[PDB]
Amino acid sequence: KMNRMRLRIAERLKQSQNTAASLTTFNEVDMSALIEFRNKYKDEVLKKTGVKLGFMSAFSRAVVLAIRDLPVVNASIEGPNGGDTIVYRDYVDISVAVATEKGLVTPVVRNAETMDLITIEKTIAELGKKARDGKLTIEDMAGGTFTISNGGVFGSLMGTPIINLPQSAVLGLHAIKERPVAVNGKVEIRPMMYLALTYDHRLLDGREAVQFLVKVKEYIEDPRKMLL
Amino acid sequence: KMNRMRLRIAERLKQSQNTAASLTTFNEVDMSALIEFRNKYKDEVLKKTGVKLGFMSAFSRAVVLAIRDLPVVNASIEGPNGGDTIVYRDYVDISVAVATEKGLVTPVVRNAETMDLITIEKTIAELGKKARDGKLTIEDMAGGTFTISNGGVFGSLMGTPIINLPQSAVLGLHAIKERPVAVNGKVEIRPMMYLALTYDHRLLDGREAVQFLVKVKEYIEDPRKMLL
Amino acid sequence: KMNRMRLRIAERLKQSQNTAASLTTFNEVDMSALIEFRNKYKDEVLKKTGVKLGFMSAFSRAVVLAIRDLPVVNASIEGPNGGDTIVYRDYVDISVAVATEKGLVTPVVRNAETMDLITIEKTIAELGKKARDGKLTIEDMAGGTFTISNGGVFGSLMGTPIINLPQSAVLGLHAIKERPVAVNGKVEIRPMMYLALTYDHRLLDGREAVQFLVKVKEYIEDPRKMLL
């Protein structure tokens, strides 16, 4: 028999689908620079800090810088029957995925727009521990302003991730693969990943939606853009 | 606060989603011939006519010829609670996208199935001017029979465009990219674009939907098919 | 005849020499990454901001990050007859050189440790204008915590720059040259520059002095280290 947890979450799915409008758009991106950079320093970083480096601070920091250009992304749509107000609050709470032994849960880094890459990475590592400990308070998983979800841990080409209502949108991350690529007028083989942006087409307009994803693409593909 | 324009359009989104069934299918296509042809003559054409040539008359004319094989595409589904009638009217009104400074609007070429490629191209150029002038009457944007939408102007791999209810379906156009391709038993590099057909699976049946997109693919990939 | 400005400054030279201890140490560094990065984006940056990009935000930001590891650099030595206190204040005021038509002057960016690379670059451009206008207030040139000086504008291999008393130390920047280099087990030709760190050997100890310069070398040679 389905328990209360199943019933609640299962309802929230098709409920949020019927509440928001919904669209998904896509792109793929070269992972080489990020991978190289990671390999070059993850040990030094670890010895300096106790922090191991994955990729997560990268994606998230890039998202923050893109949001700093496109504040529409962070805002939430509110009032009766969807309501009346785009809530322009511009602190950024980054919800992200963790799979406990009892399945999917969503820790939220509060005020992430203040943070350094290394600090984000550390903060996430803390939450991952505390999550498998079952120590999390519900305020750790009360909704943020934005969400990043990962299917690449299991490994897929492409997902179509769900709106974390009341948030505007969500980014999906997928398997890195070596892929044939056209670059520099040459065939090459490169580490590539696809990206999926799902967004409420209420207030996230197709122009903006594409533009956001594309700007993020740049920051991944050259980490030096983070210096701007 | 959301204004009346936002509220109306935002409702129409999830309303039309809940009204129609909905499916999207895909293909990608070589742009070379069209690009070559454009470059070869756009100047001559311009001097003969005052008309610059993009790609739009091509896609649209191809769509018309495909519709001339597949009249199911042009018809609209009507009556109470979705109703009872596939309206076989076979004049073709081509709705298309323009982004004003106040966002997205949809000029409609009436009776487009009568028109020459150059004339379609001209007609669109007229509407683009009149649109940014704000001179458009609402009858310029009262619904056509079919819709083509462009995300390639912003530049993306792939979108999932919305049904312009009561129309049957919509075609999305995307970024042209150089891509590695297998052709002639050889690896080559070519200008490629992806295509997305979204359709109401009420009355647009999977067979037909695929067949339509595929026929269009041919007309793009060899403009000489337009001579048939 | 020497005027008051000459007499004051001329005294301050040999006075500060007799006041501090004094040592200079050296290294040279590859400019390629920074040069590439600059060329790749200076136009985009300019259109986004009104700011042209030289190199200065790079050197300075690197210096700040090195100071964040080595706070000894920022502190000043104070009290009677040189005194008694290493003043650990850790806001960072970056003095830098401008040659007016009446010769050398030293604008100071206050609180520079807070700033982004682009913002530093902008701030400097503002000061350069205001300097040639003669609009500067003396508080613009009351001493900072650290100093960077440039001879490369005139173009030399190597200088030996003077302690801006009461500051601990100073960095000299020189001509970029193409130079033969050994890299990757191969002879190569690269854009190279020499660096000179002059420091008061009171409280800047040889270990620390070398270590500071070397850490800066890294940040220049890979801008991706700034991401740490």
Next chain:
Amino acid sequence: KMNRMRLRIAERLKQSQNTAASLTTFNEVDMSALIEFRNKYKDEVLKKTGVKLGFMSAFSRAVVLAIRDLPVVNASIEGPNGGDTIVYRDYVDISVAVATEKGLVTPVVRNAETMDLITIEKTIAELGKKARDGKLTIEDMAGGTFTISNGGVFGSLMGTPIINLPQSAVLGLHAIKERPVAVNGKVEIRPMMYLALTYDHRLLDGREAVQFLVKVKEYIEDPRKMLL
């Protein structure tokens, strides 16, 4: 606040600067032979003696043999207001650097001119242990006749080391680097190091100063010269 140790040493710096004249001159040298020789035998040597081999006995022994040609180097300048006497005592006490956890200290090998390379190396290893033990008596660090200082442990191109008053001069050692070199009419890549001789230009005359450094260069570059 600065403690007594800081105050004493800080004074000794600018005091000794104002007491001596002061000049520094430079050269660079191939490390290959010494490196090869070290690698070839350090294990055998260790098993025969309990002594590991760095480079230090080499530099020091070379310095001694050069001093045996140029006794001016070892002598000290003495009497009131700098005085009247070049003290020709020709036993050689080699001061050298150790960085304790409390910073820089200077053990002195007494009567080093008597010693074998292996014995010098051993003697230094003993002192290094006793230094980190804090067991040293002050007579271990009462001034020798000459000084060698190392910045290469931290790793730099070039320093400008301070006169250990009353000694005549000091040698600085730096980072070994692979460097492009011209040799045998050919471009080659080699392990190279720069050398800096600082000397009191009272009684160390420019002729002599250059000649000393150059002779040392030979002994490093061919260890077989030690056989003369």
